[PDB]
């Protein structure tokens, strides 16, 4: 059981409670460790641990930079000669029982890295250069098989049922981009195109964009671009619904706006776009909208029912929503915000490091907990809709910018005080306001052609 000295090879330091802790028996579950110990167990000489490699490569950016990880696995790979007894059999055993397994597991880590987290190398061309140069130094028949599989993955990554229904149109005509609006597009097609858009945004989020609250930090535009696009779309669309409502000062027109949004909601439900469903529910519960007694008074009972049923999905910490999401059949778009809430709760209720005898250990169980949440997200990221894109409508909703250059605080105050203008507080009477729409308010309904 020979080994190089821990002075010339850091990974040979003995396990202790001050550098690695396991969960409270064949393969242990790591709870915490120094980065050096985590990497040793990532590439352990005694066994492979795919589940640990999986969790590590999803979460490691919360405790180690990508260029740093590559440096550490190179350090891991380049094993020095073992420390000598005063006096080949023990030498040969070291190369067969230590060097070869460790170096193979390092290459497996590199393969998993490019196979499932190639975006690290798309964001950092030099990281990919270092990796290609490193695996280029590898010698031996057994390991060139792994070099070959890594190289083939990299090359492929550099390169990269039935008819959908007819697109529906209402007042706005195809190609008439300047006429597109809440009441002028067909409510079926608004819901379809937003569902296609939100399906795409949901499917693009990588689990690592969700780790370590990295989307609320300094490099967020590089580390969480797809997550940020999702969140900002949900903000812009929700605020656009509120804006369409309160900027419609005439009561009859505003009832038509709210009714139409409930029809879009109904189609979201039929499409299992729970993301869209809860965006509508959020708009209807918002400060500027929820207080509009005179508007909700005129909503027909059947639509009140649809809104009430969507709202109840959110009660009791989304109990009915979680039940409905289990029971539906694909395709769907899950409600994305609930995962962010659960992740932030996990991030806040667990420490970044654990202490043992004054030494700091990366709390890996905390990363595993977040990774389990991101795994449930992934289970829904391959469910395309049999719906045709309308490129102009898609662009209309991609470009929604209700706030303009203002910030959400001033903008929300703007919406809320507008609400007070159109429906004054309860002693005051209700003024009449001019119409703003010259086209008919009557909905075409949500039955397809």
């Amino acid at each position, epitope marked *: 059981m020979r080994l190089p000295s821990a002075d010339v090879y850091r990974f040979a330091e003995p396990d202790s409670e001050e550098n690695i802790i396991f969960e409270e028996a064949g393969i242990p579950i790591i709870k915490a460790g120094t980065v050096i110990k985590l990497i040793e167990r990532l590439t352990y000489h005694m066994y492979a641990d795919p589940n640990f490699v999986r969790t590590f490569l999803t979460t490691y950016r919360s405790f180690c930079k990508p260029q740093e990880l590559l440096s550490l696995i190179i350090e891991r790979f380049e094993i020095p000669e073992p420390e000598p007894t005063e006096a080949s059999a023990e030498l040969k055993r070291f190369r067969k029982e230590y060097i070869q397994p460790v170096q193979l597991r390092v290459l497996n880590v590199c393969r998993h890295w490019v196979e499932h987290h190639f975006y690290d190398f798309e964001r950092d061309a030099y990281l990919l250069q270092r990796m290609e140069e490193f695996i280029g130094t590898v010698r031996g028949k057994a390991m060139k098989k792994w070099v070959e599989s890594i190289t083939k993955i990299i090359q492929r990554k550099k390169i990269a049922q039935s008819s959908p229904p007819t697109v529906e149109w209402h007042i706005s005509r195809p190609g008439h981009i300047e006429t597109f609006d809440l009441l002028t597009l067909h409510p079926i097609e608004i819901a379809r195109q937003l569902t296609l858009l939100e399906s795409d945004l949901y499917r693009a989020v990588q689990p690592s964009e969700l780790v370590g609250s990295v989307w609320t930090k300094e490099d967020k535009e590089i580390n969480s671009p797809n997550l940020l696009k999702m969140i900002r779309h949900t903000t812009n669309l929700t605020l656009w619904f509120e804006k369409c409502i309160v900027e419609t000062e005439n009561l009859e027109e505003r009832v038509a706006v709210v009714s139409r949004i409930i029809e879009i909601l109904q189609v979201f439900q039929e499409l299992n776009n729970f993301n869209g469903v809860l965006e509508v529910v959020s708009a*209807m*519960n*918002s*400060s*500027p909208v*929820y*207080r509009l007694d005179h508007t*909700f008074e005129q909503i027909p009972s059947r639509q*009140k029912k649809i*809104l*009430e049923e969507a*709202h*109840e999905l959110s*009660e009791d910490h989304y109990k009915k929503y979680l039940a409905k999401l289990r029971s539906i059949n694909p395709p769907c778009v899950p409600f994305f915000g609930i995962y962010l809430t659960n992740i932030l709760k996990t991030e806040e209720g667990n420490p970044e490091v654990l202490k043992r005898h004054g030494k700091e250990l990366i709390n890996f169980s905390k990363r595993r907990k977040v990774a389990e949440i991101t795994g449930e997200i992934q289970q829904y990221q391959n469910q395309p809709y049999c719906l045709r894109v309308e490129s102009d409508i898609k662009r209309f909703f991609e470009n929604l910018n209700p706030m303009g250059n203002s910030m959400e605080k001033e903008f*929300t*105050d703007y919406l*809320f005080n507008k609400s*007070l203008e159109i429906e004054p*507080r*309860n*002693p005051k009477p209700l003024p009449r306001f001019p119409k703003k729409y010259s086209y008919p308010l009557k909905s075409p309904g949500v039955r397809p052609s």
Partner: nanobody
Amino acid sequence: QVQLVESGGGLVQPGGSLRLSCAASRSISSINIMGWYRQAPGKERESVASHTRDGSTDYADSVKGRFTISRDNAKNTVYLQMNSLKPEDTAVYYCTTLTGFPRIRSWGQGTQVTVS
């Protein structure tokens, strides 16, 4: 619905101050609107102050600058801090919530405030 329990209130000199409190039987963080109304003798009941989850507030004109509505999530309580009280503020004050779809309004018991 929501059971609402008011406290505070009573008699105070003109120019004095008083804080009403209203405790909810459920978590206020999911209650869209909490507010206070009042009915002075001879008049109809009027809204005094309201407060939404995101902190948006509105007030009767006659109390702007003097009254402040706020929430305390840890105690599931909404407050009405009333400063610079005037004899025209004498009334029964009522805690209220509006939340959910259907939009359910709940009411506290009513609390006498006398400024004389």
